Structure formats: C-alpha cells, structure tokens
Amino acid sequence: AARSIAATPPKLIVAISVDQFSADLFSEYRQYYTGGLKRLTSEGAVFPRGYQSHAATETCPGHSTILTGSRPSRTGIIANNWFDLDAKREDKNLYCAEDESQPGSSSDKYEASPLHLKVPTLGGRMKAANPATRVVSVAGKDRAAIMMGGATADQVWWLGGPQGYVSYKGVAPTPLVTQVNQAFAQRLAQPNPGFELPAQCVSKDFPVQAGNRTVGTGRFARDAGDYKGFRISPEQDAMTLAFAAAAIENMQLGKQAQTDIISIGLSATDYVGHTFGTEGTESCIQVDRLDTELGAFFDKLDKDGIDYVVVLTADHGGHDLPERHRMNAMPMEQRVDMALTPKALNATIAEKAGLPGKKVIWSDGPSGDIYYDKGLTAAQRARVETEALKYLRAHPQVQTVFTKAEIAATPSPSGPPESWSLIQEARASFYPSRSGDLLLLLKPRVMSIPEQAVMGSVATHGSPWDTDRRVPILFWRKGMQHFEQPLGVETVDILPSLAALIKLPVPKDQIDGRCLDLVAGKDDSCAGQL
Ligand SMILES: [Ca+2]
Ligand SMILES: [Zn+2]
Ligand SMILES: [Zn+2]
C-alpha cells in the first residue's frame, strides 16, 4: 500500500555505509540490481550525486559525517591518522579511532575509542531525547562502527580478526555474539570455491599487471582458514548483515514504543577496490553479491514486520588503478612519483632548506597533511615552508599546496558541493589542533600509490577529486513515493533528514548539514524546526 515516508515516525532507523561504494561504481552496475539495491533505487528517494564533500576522502572522516550531520572540520576526524607532535608517547602518529592516552599504546597497537569524535551521533541525540532508545553499530572495521555509533552507543561491534566480532576493551561477547562468531569460525574453516561470473561481470574478465601483481580476474576462491582472503571478499559483508539481522531480532529493535537505530558498515567493497581496483571481476562480483545479500536482509526485516526506514550511502568514492585506465581510454592516468612519499620528500625538503639529513617534516603519504617538526627554530621553520612550497608547486603531478593559514581563513563552505573550490573542500576537513601545516593536493588522475616492483594495494581514494567525493545516498521506507534528485547533496544532510522523520529537533548551529525533504511533490518531511 502507498504510504508517505513521513506519515508516522518509523520504529527503526537502519543506516548502511558501504565502504568505497563510489557513485561511479554504484551507477555503473545500477542497471543489473535485482535485490536490495533495486529496492532502494526503484522505490526510494534517490540522490545519485551525494558528496562526502571534504577533501580528506578517507574512511574515518567519511564515517564521521554519516550520522553526525557534521563535516570533518566539526567532527575533528580529519584523516584516518594525524600527527600530534606534542603527544606524550613515542609514536606521534595518532589513529582516528584510538585513545592515545593509554599507557604503552601506539598507532600500531591501540585501544579502540570514540574519544576523538567531537560531536554526538544521531543515536546519541535520540538517546538524549529518550533514554529507552537502543543504539547499535556493527561493521567490518572498528572505525566505521565506532564513528557511526558514537560515545553513548549500547552495542558497538567490528570484525577483529579470525576470532570474529569484538568490541571495546572490557566488553564480553553476548550469547548472540558467540553464536555469530561460532558461525563465522565454521565458514572460515571451509574452503570457498569462489563465484562464477554474473552476466555483467563477464566483460570485465581480463588480467591487468601492476608491478608484481596481476588483477582483473579474481573470483574469491580461497583456502580454508585464509582470513585475509575472507576479509577481502563478499564473505565478510554477508557475515556483517547476518550479525545485524540477528541483533535486530534478539534486541527487538523497532518493536518497542520508541524508535531504535542500527548502523551497519559493510567493509568488503573497500578491501576489494584497494586490492584489485574497481572495474574488474572482483568488484563486479562483490557489488552483485552486495545487492543479493541486502535483498535477503531487507526480506528478513520485512518478514519480521518491522517498520524501518533505511539510508544507504558510502564513506567516500573510489578510483580504478592507472594500469587498467590506460587500457580503457585514459592514457594520462598515472602513479605518483616515489619522490613525494614521506621519507623521500622529507629528505629533499630538509636538504633544500639547508638542513640535510634532519627530520624537518612529517607526513604519511604522498598527499594530504604535512607537519613541520617541532624542533625547528622559527627561522628554520620559515625556510622549510618556503622550500616545501617551492618544490611541491614546481612538481608536475602536484595540483596545489595550501598553507594552514590559507585554509583557516576560508569560511566554512555553503552552496552546491559539486562546484566547490579545492580550498573549500580542504576547509571542510580542516581542524586546527589536528590539521597539518600544509595540505598537498595531487592533480586529477594521479594515483597516490607509487609504482613498485613489489606492491600491495593497487588503487585508492583519498583525493579531493570527484571520483573520491561522489557517493550515492538512498533513502527507503515501505510504500513511499520514489523520486530521483540528481543535484548535489552532502552526507552531512543525512542526520537532519532522518531526524525530521522522527520529529527530533537538531539545533542548526550544531551541525553543518541541512534537512533533505524525502517526500516527493507537495508535502515536505522537513516542515518544522529543520
Ligand atoms: Ca516535497
Ligand atoms: Zn572507507
Ligand atoms: Zn579505503
């Protein structure tokens, strides 16, 4: 039966982040969905040009926007890792989702924590308005689960390894979690024969060499006990969705008086895209499995009779590896110069600044935030800035370099995210106590993974360009009226759009997003405070 998505408050909010599910990838395969993604695109409110609008198009900044209504400039989550050169501990690199105050910690051996997140999540705001609210977050990555759930979440679980799903220190598995992990262990202990190709994947079945690796033809065959293989496959998304459905039923989410919320971070698409690039059989199979498993998941919830509303989006977009782009009509695609990577860049800048052999800058990839060493004198700091700017601006693969002061002086951006300037994008993931002294941006179609004889990941996101910012945002509730809205919107718009449905006020001055009307035609779901 036809029924407005705003007719009454939904009893359950289901928020799904598909890691690296770019609008490019989503759109390419849109015509082949038959399951859960067909349900959302054919019946839902469809924003195919959503934006993780900031420059720092990584997993942690992206997840911090989805259920906070807040850009990274406000969440404080400006990268997966940032330096705190004043940190007490020896490792000045901080992980986005750790508590570095813990003794004996490092960015390699950390204690998971939402402490770095400066704002509440939607579940936190629902819980402040009504303590009976349950707030649940499950993902294949701790940072996804943590940043979507927020500090007051009831249950936060993520895939921790071959042991299965785990939570914060001190949190023992419930009977449900042990059952889930027993099921997980049994699946892992069985070989997976892999997947024959869906029709749409047959055309993608050709090998591409990158350094010592060959990609393009994988079908997720894997040995028993091969956890790496399990992690980089549709298998972990199936597990995470099963875990979510069981949690929903076991906790009776959506079946009480108040509205509950569960966030789900489906990580496989990202591992797959990193390891193989995005246009081969591996991503193609993964996206088709995603559609199927989402369909099974929505069918279970429907069978349970739950009145739920869904939002599905991504934490960032993605970009294919250069070697395949060059085969497919993009011959200018290329990998970043090894000279721009951290060790080589620091050695170059230190030398030009008259300080050869010294540590003068800190960085953790060939783009993004660069920090001056705190042990520089003011004069030395000034030479280092001058030489860094001079050298990077003259490099043929560099688009531009912003100083901290230039970004700071930029007003928080407004207006259509699809036509922002680069510095507006930078401003949207600028947070003074955590951001670098310089922000390095590479030219379009330069992949920030240099060519090497021995390589790992062949492709990544993290650039300020459209492939990496643009993501779908899909909303759905049984019986609603579908519409398509192709103009740009931001993932920070998601929180106020859901809050309106449950009549939760959200002070406009505490968030960056705006309410999106999810009611096609005359009536307006946002009518009210938002
Ligand atoms: Ca309307
Ligand atoms: Zn991600
Ligand atoms: Zn990634």
From Swiss-Prot:
Binding of Zn(2+) 1: at which residues? D19, T59, D315, H316
Note on cofactor: Binds 2 Zn(2+) ions.
Catalysed reaction equations from the record: a phosphate monoester + H2O = an alcohol + phosphate
**Where can this protein be found?**
Secreted
Active site: residue positions:
T59 (phosphothreonine intermediate)
Per the record, pH dependence is: Optimum pH is 9.0.
> What Enzyme Commission number(s) appear in the record?
3.1.3.1
Cofactors:
Zn(2+)
Q: Name one GO cellular component term.
A: extracellular region
Q: How does it assemble?
A: Monomer.
Query: This chain belongs to which protein, by name?
Result: Alkaline phosphatase PhoK
Tell me which species this is from.
Sphingomonas sp
| Encoding gene, per UniProt annotation | phoK
